[PDB]
Symmetry: C2
Subunit: 177 residues, 2 copies
């Protein structure tokens, strides 16, 4: 059994920070860009090592998601990756056990964007698929992000959420979800 360790970005020593960046970049099935790397920073990284090398990573960063006029405090998951030689060993579950613990202890909900493949994993853990329109609060005002519809999942922490409502994330460069 593997258990993930939660390390804040600030506690990533240089060697470890570089190892995570390259592992995630080399494992992500999406096109993981420099801006996607930047989106993994600022919060808590769930890490698993094997004999000195990083083999699994998931970060949970803090942002706001606006739901019916309220800017909810969100733990957003980024950069979930397991090194190719370590897949099939339930490491993703271990990473999610760690970031969900952070959500329960610090946020009003967790949220993430899922690969269509991975949808079943998140649903099996209790995450709910968002059905309403997603959008981002851009500098010009709200902008709908339909390409992201159907990819967002939420893990409310003791709050109710009508998942058919709009969910508007806050702005950043690159992929907003």
């Amino acid at each position: 059994v593997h258990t993930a360790r939660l390390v804040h970005t600030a506690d990533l020593d240089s060697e470890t920070r570089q190892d995570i960046r390259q592992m995630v970049t080399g494992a992500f099935a999406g096109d993981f860009t420099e801006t996607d790397w930047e989106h993994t920073l600022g919060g808590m990284h769930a890490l698993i090592w094997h004999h000195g090398a990083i083999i699994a990573h998931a970060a949970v960063i803090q942002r706001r998601l606006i739901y019916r006029g309220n800017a909810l405090r969100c733990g957003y998951v980024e950069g979930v990756a397991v090194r190719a030689d370590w897949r099939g060993q339930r490491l993703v579950s271990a990473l999610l056990d760690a970031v969900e613990q952070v959500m329960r202890g610090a946020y009003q909900l967790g949220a993430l964007s899922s690969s269509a493949r991975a949808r079943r994993l998140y649903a099996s853990r209790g995450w709910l698929p968002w059905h309403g329109p997603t959008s981002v609060l851009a500098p010009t005002g709200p902008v709908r992000t339909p390409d992201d519809d159907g990819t967002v999942f939420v893990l409310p922490i003791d709050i109710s959420l009508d998942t058919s409502a709009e969910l508007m994330c806050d702005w950043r460069a690159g992929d907003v979800w």
Copy 2:
């Protein structure tokens, strides 16, 4: 002999119920009761620098993650909230101990540190390298940008290896309550 007290850094998620209550009670006292439900919410989500005495919290500061828009870019910011030292523990350089811990988190995780300062606190922040923001401040509210003129002249920034022109506009992201 020199007496040195230092802060321990604890994530919100690792604060147990008793500690959350003690922090909230102490911060409330430090602000003479002016610490609202939303002010408390704003201290949650990130790292808290904590100093105790006899098991009671005597100093607190939080650094939470948010974005501040500068020159069209949403900078990754560590924003300081809830800086407080219990009134019987002043003059012992505990604010400096708190800021040593807060600034360590900023340097390791963010592009800049930011905060809104009381008039009396301006001197210590500047002395530590914090730069007063001179340009107009705004918030990216849900229907678009809104100027926050009452907050002009109160925001300080701690750039982390990026050079900032403090005469530019600075627009924080949205939240309930005090946006800055």
